[PDB]
């Protein structure tokens, strides 16, 4: 994978199918892609597969299990502090790989499959070069932040917005993903 | 259904590309001229015709989706050809860029009108003409999105 970074989205389930599957915990659907649009009866957000693990934000997945074709799957990692949870990446998904170039120029992939430039202004923050209303970003928690070669730099967590417009975003650097695995 | 950002177009004389940016289907004036674009309801005329910039634009056709302009100022461009081939191009200036790996002109033929993307897939410019030395294209000429933005 590399550049230019292009992304597309595909809906696979609807409101009722999601609820039944949520309860049954058995999803026999075909899974493809590196980023999965995820949902609970509460909210919808994203989960990103990095190195065989499907990572998402704790404030969305809480400590719930992921519905798989073999019943619910318990989390592999939970880290309330890092705001991370991770389940084994579903069979069929493709994983991203952590960044290894230290690029300061990141690209956040929204739930609508829009790639938006973000200039890193710290270990867990970056600013939108072209701000957007906070609604553009709703549902995007857990989504990936990539460097020019399409490697994971971090997972979108919260947006630093003011007056209703997101000007910057706070993310979970891929390093926390490592510290969360070792412990 | 699936919508395309880049349309492959033709005139009796030639074939080239058009790119949809900001709701307008842009292409090179040296390809379209002042011709209208075909539609199921009859020919639709150019919204913009900037003969100077070698630029023309009609209202975006059907089965198309618009591309977003670049706002990251990257110099790492990527040219999409008429065969959907992607060619890495390093920007040399306002409207010029060097192919990272030169290709024989045939490979770039018929792609004018196509887009020059930044590492985020956003429109940096519109492919105007290939700058080749002895049949080998090693650079490209392009219309910056800002120009399209200005013409609107």
């Amino acid at each position: 994978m590399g550049a230019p970074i292009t992304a597309y989205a595909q809906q696979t389930r609807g409101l009722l199918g999601c609820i039944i599957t949520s309860l049954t915990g058995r999803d026999k659907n075909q899974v493809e892609g590196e980023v999965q649009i995820v949902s609970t009866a509460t909210q919808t957000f994203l989960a990103t597969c990095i190195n065989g693990v499907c990572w998402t934000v704790y404030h969305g997945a809480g400590t719930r299990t992921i519905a798989s074709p073999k019943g619910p799957v318990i989390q592999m990692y939970t880290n309330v502090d890092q705001d991370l949870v991770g389940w084994p990446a579903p069979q069929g998904s493709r994983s991203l790989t952590p960044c290894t170039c230290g690029s300061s120029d990141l690209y956040l992939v929204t739930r609508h499959a829009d790639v938006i430039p973000v200039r890193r202004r710290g270990d867990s923050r970056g600013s939108l070069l072209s701000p957007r209303p906070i609604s553009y970003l709703k549902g995007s928690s857990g989504g990936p932040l990539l460097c020019p070669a399409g490697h994971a730099v971090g997972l979108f967590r919260a947006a630093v917005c003011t007056r209703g417009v997101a000007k910057a975003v706070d993310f979970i650097p891929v390093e926390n993903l490592e510290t969360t695995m070792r412990s | 259904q699936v919508e395309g950002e880049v349309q492959i177009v033709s005139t009796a004389t030639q074939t080239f590309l058009a790119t949809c940016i900001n709701g307008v289907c842009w292409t090179v004036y040296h390809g379209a001229g002042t011709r209208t674009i075909a539609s199921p309801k009859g020919p639709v005329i150019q919204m913009y015709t900037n003969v100077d910039q070698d630029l023309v634009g009609w209202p975006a056709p059907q089965g198309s989706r618009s591309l977003t302009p670049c706002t990251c100022g990257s110099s790492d461009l990527y040219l999409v050809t008429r065969h959907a081939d992607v060619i890495p191009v390093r920007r040399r200036g306002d409207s010029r860029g060097s192919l990272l790996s030169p290709r024989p002109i045939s490979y770039l033929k018929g792609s004018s009108g196509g887009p020059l993307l930044c590492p985020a897939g956003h429109a940096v410019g519109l492919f105007r003409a290939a700058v080749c030395t002895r049949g080998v294209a090693k650079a490209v000429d392009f219309i910056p999105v800002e120009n399209l933005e200005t013409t609107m």
């Binding site: 994978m1 970074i5 809906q11 649009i37 995820v38 949902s39 499959a113 | 081939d85």
Partner: peptide, 22 residues
Amino acid sequence: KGSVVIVGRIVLSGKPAIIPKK
């Protein structure tokens, strides 16, 4: 609580393609 369910996806692996005729 109930399980988190995959409701869709976003694919980065894709690359420019001439949309095939139907």
